[PDB]
Amino acid sequence: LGLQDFDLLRVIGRGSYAKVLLVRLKKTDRIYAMRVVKKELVNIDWVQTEKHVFEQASNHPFLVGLHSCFQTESRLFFVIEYVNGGDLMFHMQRQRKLPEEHARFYSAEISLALNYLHERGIIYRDLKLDNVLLDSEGHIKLTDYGMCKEGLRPGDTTSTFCGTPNYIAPEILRGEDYGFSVDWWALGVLMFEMMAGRSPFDIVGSNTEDYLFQVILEKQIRIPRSLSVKAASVLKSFLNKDPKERLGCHPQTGFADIQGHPFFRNVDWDMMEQKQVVPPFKPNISGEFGLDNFDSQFTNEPVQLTPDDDDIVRKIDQSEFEGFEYINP
């Protein structure tokens, strides 16, 4: 399609590779979110990765799916389903701290989603509060596929150093080759944040990234003692710095191990995958699109695209982008 097919309503975010907009398909007045990527950032086959993952997302409830895909001379566009509940970064700023029951719910749904990607050879690589979105009904969706690695087979590994430092696994920091194990670590950090109301690394939330990397590799994490033994135990299991011994990471039993953990014993996993468990919290939809659930530092921005510089535009291979246009049936 084309930019002219849509009406550009508000800016709602800054992704890992993208600027995220709220748009309306003018021909239908349907509303969608739209990820806009500067080709100057992509031209390894990233586009291939992105579309490969969007393809998996159609078939799972906890992964945001793709409506369509188009391009101008300077940018890529992905029109994706709009999730108006907001993300967990916003939820945590507002809630401060979540009860164990809430955290169990979100982590269960997140586990399903990670496991779904893994079984199909994909490492997510950017699991974090900002990248977890709430459905209007209160269920979660993983968005942002920018850092994904796909095609990973058993015994296959990668070595690419990337992610969000707060959530970067120890094996990456040591410069080892790594697999799915890093998502489970990231989930670890994320569960800690939900239940303790802060990052397990003090400097985050209080200075160079290198120090953060050291803190991650060196400090023993300290679990708040108010937490139940179940909760505590799952956190230390996920935040084991040796990926060989970390919860979820065994090659054969990894997901079962999670599901068999005492913290999750309270979970009917298949009723969960089917969205038949009731969310512990129901986002409040303003009626104004639910834009209230988005950081104002975005929503108070002109929806204007920044004109392209003809020095760079002509100096980028439009060929790495052939036959990119797409519509989901």
Partner: peptide, 16 residues
Amino acid sequence: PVLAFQREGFGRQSMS
């Protein structure tokens, strides 16, 4: 910690 979660603050910025 009042500023526990700061969007895109220290350590919360994506990188590759």
